[PDB]
């Protein structure tokens, strides 16, 4: 169920998704498919 509400909550642990894309990866999330840009790629930095 809070799928968005966790991948941004475990990306702000790296915040790179604070720039790229920021608010996209709470708000909407999921839809934006384009290279999976969430926690899961962000975390590898």
């Given at each position: 169920?809070?799928?968005?509400?966790?991948?941004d909550?475990?990306?702000?642990?790296?915040?790179?998704?604070?720039?790229?894309?920021?608010?996209?990866?709470?708000?909407?999330?999921?839809?934006?498919?384009?290279?999976?840009?969430?926690?899961?790629?962000?975390?590898?930095?």
């Open positions: 169920l809070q799928i968005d509400r966790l991948i909550r475990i990306t702000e642990r790296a915040e790179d998704s604070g720039n790229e894309s920021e608010g996209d990866q709470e708000e909407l999330s999921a839809l934006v498919e384009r290279g999976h840009l969430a926690p899961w790629d962000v975390d590898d930095l």
